């Protein structure tokens, strides 16, 4: 039961007690994901308009 690194200031204090010792995607790659999904939306919408045109 030891207290280590005790810091004291006007607004409070803080310390550490030890009980027992132990034993990314680039910016380019994000554009491709966003656009890829925008292309799948465009394709899906195309097949709808192609359906409605038929």
């Amino acid at each position: 039961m030891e207290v280590i690194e005790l810091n004291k200031c006007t607004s409070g204090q803080s310390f550490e007690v030890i009980l027992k010792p132990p034993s990314d995607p680039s910016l380019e790659e994000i554009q491709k994901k966003l656009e890829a999904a925008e292309e799948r939306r465009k394709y899906q919408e195309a097949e709808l308009l192609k359906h409605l045109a038929e």
């Binding site: 919408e45 709808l48 308009l49 409605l52």
Partner: protein, 425 residues
């Protein structure tokens, strides 16, 4: 400012839509002239959802009245709130549709559709941010059925990413106008399966049985049936027209109510349904027991024959919200055999403080139940009863249709029934 554009087409379409505006206009304090006169700011909070604001603080419904004959809309124009509508929004022909889906979808209707879309486009352009469209109509006639579905097809072409909801009166031989109603209903249902996000199924027989048996009306009239629809339509749009911790637009509701694109046909319901013992106070248990009772549901389908995919319940009035949660959780946890266990928490509840005119508190029920397949089964059986003998087909082949298109509509709905059946096991 999430605006909705309303469209009512045909005889049934316009007489039901008329009463709907009569009901909500009373709830928002709008008089027959369009001037506000309520006593609460909640009445104007979301007023622009269904009304436009004109000069002099006038509120004009965002509604388009459509029909192939003048008769019905002449009645609306001279009805109670007839004056409140926008004159330019009456679009109608003179030939009529003769209860023929083909006349409304392909011939007569095709001649009038463009002018209707001109008014729709005009209302949308004035929308800050259009939520979507709602259509009232029947499926058994010619205009609301055939031209109504033609309108949805053309509205989806021009507004592909807007929500399309409908209140569709399903035909019933008990409350029937013509023998061809199964033909017309079968043709429209395929259009709705493809081009609507939410369709509230109202079965004219359920409306009749409620007036006769529950409401104690010896001889119901179409007006009587339309009182129920008006009140139900007011109930399900409460989430949209008034404030609350809801904050849900058409698309948000569709996302949580429709687990599969084709199975978007709902059973609506209302409570109380009291006969004239009408001033008796109703408790939350009674409101809840009745709202889930089949006799309070308007699809003429027994929910105990299928399973609920999702269920929404709206409570109106000043009541114990804690007591509301206790009762809903009592209906579920007492009959969890009727809710699919593969959609966690598929029963959602919403509360509103403003009760319908002349009621301390009401409850509206919106259920996406696989039992609705019985509705499509009835229609399909009656369709095949005639189409097997090609009875009355000449009315349609004379308008340019072919038998092949009837066979396809047949197959399309028998498929729709099969889909509802696989999700019930």
């Amino acid at each position: 400012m999430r605006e909705i554009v309303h469209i009512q087409a045909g005889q049934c379409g316009n007489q039901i839509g008329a009463k709907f505006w009569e009901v909500i206009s009373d709830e928002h304090g709008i008089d027959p002239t369009g001037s506000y006169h309520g006593d609460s700011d909640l009445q104007l909070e979301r007023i622009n959802v269904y009304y436009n604001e004109a000069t002099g603080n006038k509120y004009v419904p965002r509604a388009i009245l459509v029909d192939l004959e003048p008769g019905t809309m002449d009645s609306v124009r001279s009805g109670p709130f007839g004056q409140i509508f926008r004159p330019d929004n009456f679009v109608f022909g003179q030939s009529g549709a003769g209860n023929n889906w083909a006349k409304g979808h392909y011939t007569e209707g095709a001649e009038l559709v463009d002018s209707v879309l001109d008014v729709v486009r005009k209302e949308s352009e004035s929308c800050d941010c259009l939520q979507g469209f709602q259509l009232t109509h029947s499926l058994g006639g010619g205009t609301g059925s055939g031209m109504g579905t033609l309108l949805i097809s053309k509205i989806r072409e021009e507004y592909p990413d807007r929500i399309m909801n409908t209140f569709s009166v399903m035909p019933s031989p008990k409350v029937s106008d013509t023998v061809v109603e199964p033909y017309n209903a079968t043709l429209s249902v395929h259009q709705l399966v493809e081009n609507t996000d939410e369709t509230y199924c109202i079965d004219n027989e359920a409306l009749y049985d409620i007036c006769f048996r529950t409401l104690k009306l010896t001889t119901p009239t179409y007006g009587d049936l339309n009182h129920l629809v008006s009140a139900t339509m007011s109930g399900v749009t409460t989430c949209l027209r008034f404030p609350g911790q809801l904050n849900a637009d058409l698309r948000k509701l569709a996302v949580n109510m429709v687990p599969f694109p084709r199975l978007h046909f709902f059973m609506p319901g209302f409570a109380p349904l009291t006969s004239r013992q009408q001033y008796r106070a109703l408790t939350v248990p009674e409101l809840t027991q009745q709202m889930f009772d089949s006799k309070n549901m308007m699809a003429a389908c027994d929910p105990r024959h299928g399973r609920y995919l999702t269920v929404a319940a709206i409570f109106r009035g000043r009541m114990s919200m804690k007591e509301v949660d206790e009762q809903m959780l009592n209906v579920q946890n007492k009959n969890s055999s009727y809710f699919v266990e593969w959609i966690p928490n598929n029963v959602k509840t919403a509360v509103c403080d403003i009760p319908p005119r002349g009621l301390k508190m009401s409850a509206t029920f919106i259920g996406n139940s696989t039992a609705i397949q019985e509705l499509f089964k009835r229609i399909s059986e009656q369709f095949t009863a005639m189409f097997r003998r090609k009875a009355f087909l000449h009315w349609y082949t004379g308008e340019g249709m072919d038998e092949m298109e009837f066979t396809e509509a047949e197959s399309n709905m028998n498929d729709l029934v099969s889909e509802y059946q696989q999700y019930q096991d």
